Structure formats: C-alpha cells, structure tokens
Symmetry: D2
Subunit: 255 residues, 4 copies
Amino acid sequence: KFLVIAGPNAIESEELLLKVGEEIKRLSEKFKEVEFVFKSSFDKANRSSIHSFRGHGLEYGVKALRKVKEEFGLKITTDIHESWQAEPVAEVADIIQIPAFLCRQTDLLLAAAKTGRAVNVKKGQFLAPWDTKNVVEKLKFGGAKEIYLTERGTTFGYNNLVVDFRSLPIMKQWAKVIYDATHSVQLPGGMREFIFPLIRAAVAVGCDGVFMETHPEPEKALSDAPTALPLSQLEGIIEAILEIREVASKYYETI
Amino acid sequence: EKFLVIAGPNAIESEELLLKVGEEIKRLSEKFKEVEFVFKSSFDKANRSSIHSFRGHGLEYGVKALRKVKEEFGLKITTDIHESWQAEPVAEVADIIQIPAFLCRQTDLLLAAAKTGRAVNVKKGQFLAPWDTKNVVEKLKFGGAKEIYLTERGTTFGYNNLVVDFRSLPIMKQWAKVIYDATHSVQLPGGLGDKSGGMREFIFPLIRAAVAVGCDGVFMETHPEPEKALSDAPTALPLSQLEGIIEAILEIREVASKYYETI
Amino acid sequence: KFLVIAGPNAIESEELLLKVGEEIKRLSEKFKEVEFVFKSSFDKANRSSIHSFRGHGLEYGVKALRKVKEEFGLKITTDIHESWQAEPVAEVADIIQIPAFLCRQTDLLLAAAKTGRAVNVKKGQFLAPWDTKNVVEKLKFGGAKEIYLTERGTTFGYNNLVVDFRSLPIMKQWAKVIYDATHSVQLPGGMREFIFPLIRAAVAVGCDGVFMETHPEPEKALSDAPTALPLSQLEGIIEAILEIREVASKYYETI
Amino acid sequence: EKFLVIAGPNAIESEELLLKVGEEIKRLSEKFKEVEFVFKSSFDKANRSSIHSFRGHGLEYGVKALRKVKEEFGLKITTDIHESWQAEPVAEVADIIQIPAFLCRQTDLLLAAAKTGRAVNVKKGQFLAPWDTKNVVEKLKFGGAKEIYLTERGTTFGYNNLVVDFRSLPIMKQWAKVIYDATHSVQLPGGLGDKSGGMREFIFPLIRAAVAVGCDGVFMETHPEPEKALSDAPTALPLSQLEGIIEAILEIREVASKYYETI
Ligand SMILES: O=C(O)[C@@](O)(C[C@@H](O)[C@@H](O)[C@H](O)[C@H](O)COP(=O)(O)O)OP(=O)(O)O
Ligand SMILES: O=C(O)[C@@](O)(C[C@@H](O)[C@@H](O)[C@H](O)[C@H](O)COP(=O)(O)O)OP(=O)(O)O
Ligand SMILES: O=P(O)(O)OC[C@@H](O)[C@@H](O)[C@H](O)CO
Ligand SMILES: O=P(O)(O)OC[C@@H](O)[C@@H](O)[C@H](O)CO
C-alpha cells in the first residue's frame, strides 16, 4: 500500500516526538489503506554552519525513537551518516535512510544493507535519475531486499532545486519511489507555498509514497523551519493525495 | 471556468492534414462540452535549427488553410507570429495570437499582437524565470491586450535538455491564465543535431502533474502519423490518443480542483 | 588581427557616441595590432519593462553612427531586431549584430547575410556550443563571408548566467569567436567585479576578439548600467589582454 | 607566494605506479623550484558509481605506499579521507588532508581532519554555490585548521555534465587559498553508465583560464598510460605531458599576475 513517512526533522526532544507520534498514530488509524512510518533525525550531520543545532546524539536519539515505536506501534526511520551507525540504529529503525550527499558512499550503503533492514536512499542533488540504477545494485549486492529511492530535487543553478518529475517513472524501473515533499522546495544555503502543489503533482504522476516533515510550530523548528508542515495540516493533505491517487492511478504507466 | 485545450498539427503541412485533425478536434469538442477547444497550427517554423528543415507554405497559404478549418468546423483558431507585420493579417483568422518562446521579450512583436484586439498567448522563454513573466503581461496590458495567456514549455537545464519547474504554474497564475505545453516541455533542444529530439514517454505523466498542480489549459500537438511529421515528429501525439489523454486530464483536474490554492 | 568591439550600450545621444568614439579612436592609434569596431544599439528591443529606455529610433541611430564612422574612421557595428532593418543598417554598419534571443530566427540571419556585410551572432543563452554550427550554416547559405559567434553566457538556473569556456574552442571549429565580457556576467531580469577576471580567462583560453561595453559614467547608463565599463579603464584592460594573449597564444589548440 | 601543484595517479593501483609517478614529480620539483609540489593518490575510491569498479588496496597499504613515496623522494603528500576515523592514521603521512566533494558538508569529517594539525583541502561540492564555502572554512577554523584550501572542481549543469564558473575563484579567495582541479572539472558524472566520462581536450584550455583568472594552485591527475587507469581513465593526463602543462601555467600566471584583483 501507499507509504507516508512523516515526523519532525530533528529529535528536538522525546517530548516533541511523542506529540507528533500521537497525531501520526491517529492518522494511521483513520487511513488504514496507508502505511505510516515515523521519521526523525538524531543528528543533522551536514548543517552549513558549525553554530547550528545538530541534535542530542545517537544514544538519546535511538532512545526517543524506541519510545515512539513502543508507545504507538509505529514503524521507524532515521538517517545514518557513517558506517558504524548502521548496526545500533537498525535496532529501532525499520527503514534506514541514506542522506542525499551520501547516496554514493559505498560503505554507508553496504553497512545499511547488512543490517537486514529496509533502505531508503535520498537521491543526491547532483545525480541523474538513471544513475540511481547503480545505487540500487550496490544495495542488492549488500543484501538489501526492501529498497526505496527518494526524489528530493536536483541542483538548478545556485541555492535552488528543481523537481524533474521525469525521475519518478525512470527510478520506478528499479525501486519503489518516494517523493520528498519537504526538501524538494527548500533553497540550499525554502517556500512552503509549493509543498502541497508539488505533492499533488507527484501522486498524479505516480509514486509509491510521500516523505513529509511536520512540526507543531514550524517556525520554531531548530532545523529546516521554513519548510516544516504544520501538524494540523497533515490530515487534509493526506486525504487529498489519496483521492488524487485513486483517480490518477488508473493511468500510471506499467513500470 | 471552462478548461482550455489547444491542439493541432505542429505545422500546416497541407490544408488536408489540417482538415483531418480538425474533424477529430471538432468531434472531441462535441463530447467534451465543458472544454473550450482551440485549433492550432503554425503557418511558419521560423526558428528551425537547420536551414534545411521544413518551414511551411507561407503566411497567405497558412491563413487560408486555417480559415478553412474555422469555417468548416466552427473551431477557434490560434497560430504564432514572428515579426510585427504578421500580427494584422493573422488577426483576421486567429482568435489567439501566439508568441514564440525565443521572442517573449520582443516588445514590438508583443505590442503588435496586443493592438489587434485578439487574445495573446506567450510561450515562456526557456531562459525566463517564472517571476519574470510579470513584465511580459504588463507589456501586453499596456498594448491593449485584455485576454492574456502564459504557456509553460520548459526551462533550459544543462545542454539540449529542458526541465519543467512546476512551481511556475502557481507563480504565473498571479498575473495571467496559465497554459501547459505538454509536447515541447519534453523536447530535447537540438538533441538530434540538425533537428531537436524528444521523449514521448513523458508527455502523459507530466500532463497529469500539470493538471494536478493546477492550470487553465493544456497545449498539445498531434498528428495522424507522428513519425511522418515534418517537424517536432519525436514529440507529436498520435491523433487517436487525444481523446483518452483529454478524458484523463479532466478527471484528474476535477478531483484535484478543490485543493487548488487561491491566488 | 585581434578584434576589440566597444562602445556605449545604447545610443543615448550622438554626443555620447562622439565622446566614446574619441577615446576608442585614440586607443585604435595606440594599439595598431588591434582592429577596433565601434558598437552601440539604436534600440533596446528586448527590455524587460515597457517603461524602460529603448532609444531614439533607427533613423537617429544610423545618423549618429555615421557621424562616428566619418569623424573617426572607425568601423561600425549595431544590432538589428527584424528583417527589414538589415538593409538600412547595412549602410553604416560594417558588422551586423544578431541578438542572442534571436540567434535562431532564420529570416533575420538571412536578411543580415544578404546585405553582404559581416555578421556577428550572439549565442543564445539557451543554445549549446555545438548547436551554433547550424547558425553558421544558415549564414553561409545566405551568402555570409565574415561570420562571428559571440559567447555571452548560458542560462544557469534563474536570473544567472555562467560562462562555459569549453564553448570557445568548440565554436572556433566553424567561426571566429568573440567573447562578450560585459553581458556574460550580467544577471537576467550584473557584477562588474567579474568582468576583468573572465576577460583574462577568455584570452588565456583563446578567442578572436572581445566585446566590451563602456561609458563615461557607467552608473548613469540608461541601459545595462550595472555592467558598463568605465571609459578610463579601457586602455589598461586592452593592454592586459594583449600581453596575456601574446604569452598564451603559444598554446592555443589547432582549430 | 609559491604556486601549488598537486599531482599524482588517481588511485594507488600499486606502490610501483606511485614510485614511477613520484620520480617524475620529483624531477619536476627540481626544475620548477618556484613551485611547491604535493604528491597525490587516493588509498580508496569510496564513491564509485558501480559496486564493480576499482576501489583500492586498503588504508594500511595506501598509507604504506604513500610513506614510501615521501621517504624516497622527499615529496609532500596528500590523500582523501571518507570517514572520521581515517583522519588520525592518514595524518601520519599526509601533509594535506583532502575532503571529497560529496562530503564537503559533513561536519565530523571536517572536524576530524582539522584537529590533526595537518593542512586541509576541501573539494567544493558540485551542489555548492561559491559563497557557501565561507561556512566550510569557518567549520575548519573552528576545528583548529590553520592552513585551508578550497578546490574548484565543477558545478552540476544539467545531467551528467559539469561547468566551471570561474567567478568562484575570486569569490572563494576571500576566505581561503583556492586550488583548481584541472581533471575533474571536465569529467562527465556517470556519463558512461557504470562509470563516469570525461573530455581530455578541454583540460588544458580550462587550466589556462584558471591561472589567468588567478588561483593559488592547480590539481591534476596523471598516469603513465591514462587509458589503462583503473579509475578516471578518461581524464588522467599522460605523465609525459605534465612538464609542458606546468611550464605553460607558470608563464601565463606570471604575465597575468600583475592584474590579479586584491582581496
Ligand atoms: O530528511 C532529512 O533530514 C534530509 O532532508 C536532511 C536535511 O534535513 C538536512 O540536509 C537539512 O536540509 C540541512 O542540514 C539544512 O542546512 P542549513 O544549516 O539550514 O543550511 O535528508 P537529505 O540527505 O535529503 O538532505
Ligand atoms: O549587446 C547588446 O546590446 C546585447 O547584450 C543586448 C543587451 O544590451 C540587452 O539584452 C540588455 O541586456 C537588456 O535589454 C536589459 O534588460 P533589462 O530591461 O535591464 O532587464 O545583445 P544580446 O542579444 O546578447 O543581449
Ligand atoms: O527540430 P528543430 O529544427 O531543432 O526545431 C524545433 C522547433 O521548431 C520546435 O521545438 C518548435 O516548433 C519551435 O521551437
Ligand atoms: O567512474 P565512477 O565510478 O563514476 O567514479 C568516478 C570518481 O571516482 C571520480 O570522479 C573521482 O575519483 C571521485 O569522484
């Protein structure tokens, strides 16, 4: 079934994760035809500034995420940044996320594959759609069974990303495709007004899921604030994508 | 508001080709009564890559052939001009005057189209940012245009490739009705050397995206036998596939419409 | 010999043209190994705003340019925008300039070629280097003998142009290559600090000439003000490009 | 200030290859005494497109082979790290620690390199704007780096293509010494499918442009027989051509130097 990955960008506190986890659990009950996956980063390892929020560490992170998986029975997903983090993270994360800048780091992908968990690779902003074929092959080589590719925009001049929707059907040839509705409209080094419109485009085109970051108070997010979707808007957007998908799916091309 | 479907052969290869496509468009206009159809065909391909490629049979012949289509089928007409002097004679048959993408900044061409009293449709240049169309519309309004359209047809993305930045649809809607060009947005500029390339397998999904995002119309070239087209062959849509494509966009538009953001 | 095209962007007045013409005449006398060509537009036919300066018309324009060619004996070049302007302009213009946005308009190129004059086509910001081969062929077909291709930047995301110096050697395969040092750093819809550095790059790479706009008081230019090179800086830059060329020319690749 | 020339085989295919290239670099360092040479070679290609491409013989072997080059020829050494833990052992031989382009934003890798006391050279990511390197340098300074380099190696320009925006040289010079990567800037990312492509015919002219604009050094990969390289073959420069290229950049640099803008 259709996949919806959502949660706060960073693990600002397990308190925050439980508040978002509650709303995602609720939505999960209201939309049984959808498989929800809770997402949150235990570390922002690639901030532009040394003076920005990174997180509370992997320890506190896996701890807080475990609390969500136990308290709400929601699947879990978080990103890793170096090979050694694959094993400890695999303890709670149902899906291991590979950062976009790291989509080509062979050992990170192999370490993720080895854990036996599912792997979701964010397509680098420098990568062409067809070049993801090799990414998938590395994961298969590493023993990966559940592989996802996430579209999150492509470099378009400076401090700007454009979403080439031709990548959805192209990447679908070798993996399940997820659309990152949040970071695809962010401006490197974002504009919330384009999140919903492009989400609609992604489902009209055809994808296996949507990646969507949410926060009680977006403007207060310690990371990616100008892109955080308000918690209260999640339901409406999900209902919207399901309806569009239902009608459009009739025309999705055969693999 | 009535959705707009602009369609037709890329070039006026012959009056016969036009009448053949016109008949089908007419048939579709009878079925899809909630759609406003506009028959399109260029009397001249004035910007081919090669001096050896097909251009057309002249403005006179073209206007004559177009008039025949309007008389025989009662369809609105649209064609593009390349120099100011063509605006007047073209306005005698064209309901919508189209401005080529490379020429979207040529002040006199725009002014010439605007003073005819006809509607004007400007193809957004591959070099233009979405927010830069605000001045294009201002020029037209200044020149007297009352019905203005802006057509999205892709943006330069590296060499011989175009990308469609769907953020442009809601941006351009701030000052004009927006049209999505389903065939040229997947075209590969001069990708074939003396001719341009194209990827027909992406035409349909990108069109679905366009209507899901929200636009006021779609523009699509069609031809009985695409591979025989004298121009844009790699992008021409098989005439028999037009009905299904249209039904699909109307369905996707209906279900997505309640979510279209207010400008 | 090496070509230097210079002058004010627009014909703000024949007075302005005579003041710049005097300095270019002087430079022409000081650098005999260089062929100078006076440039100025009788109309800015593609301004973004309807409320901006266009010019005084073709009449007043050809008039003022004729005054420069007679008073200083300097060759002339100006751009045309529609086919009918080729003939009247060919009366004074030694080189007919084709605007970048119009580099693919067949009739404009043919009308220019027919006049017998030399033709300089500005490479469209949407065009690939190799795609200029066809541009040249149209001109040859039209009877052109002296054909130039000018590099003026390529679309790089929004409101930004990047100069791909690989285009110089590629275009040199079928025509003489001129480098537009002024508009190559302008931001569509500019930064003067990059004009000189990239001019140096162009000659180090290898080109047949440089296109350079100048004005007594750049900030007062009615068009392209943020890019107009100060008249007083022309000499130093020319001397600089000649010295770099002299040393680098030893390594220019064979066609 | 002494111009920097960083050169060597792309990968440590074998200690033999290294000693063969090292001998030549050593010979050149004796001739071009006004140049500071740094021998380069990766102990591991950790970001190949295909899982089937050559990677190397391990960090231990690589560091061993590099140390041999430094001992036998007295040449400075530089190699790149891929994870934080590699910084320490690599710092035992490397005079300059290189940070891969895709990893230019990985805070811990940068911090790991900085605390070794060694010089740090960051390849500017193909996704990074020139002005965005200001924070990269700040991170390094924060982590204790006293000698920092920023290397220009091209920017994403459409798919499978890189363009060099020379405006970046004077921009990055505002906060660090700038190095121009003559071989990877003309590389075609994954242009060959399971491998990347490249256009060797542009290496030389772009290098001339780099020195004419103004930089503090050039980085160039070389190999006795480029077409036999186990990686970056389409871009490796023939070892015998190194001397002439270097002489040329020194000549162009000298004549252009009086015009370099002051930062
Ligand atoms: O899902 C994610 O967490 C993330 O989008 C990573 C993203 O959160 C960060 O890259 C974030 O955009 C970045 O750290 C912001 O940097 P600034 O310091 O605000 O410029 O995955 P990616 O690898 O696609 O970037
Ligand atoms: O040499 C030229 O005159 C010109 O560079 C034309 C150039 O002067 C104009 O295009 C100018 O940049 C433009 O009119 C400025 O538009 P604004 O209205 O300031 O946005 O030739 P091109 O065809 O390469 O643009
Ligand atoms: O096939 P070439 O000659 O490149 O020209 C194609 C164009 O005519 C086509 O994209 C469209 O009709 C106008 O640009
Ligand atoms: O040839 P593939 O496998 O695409 O990788 C090439 C890269 O290793 C090369 O550009 C460089 O060594 C690092 O990116």
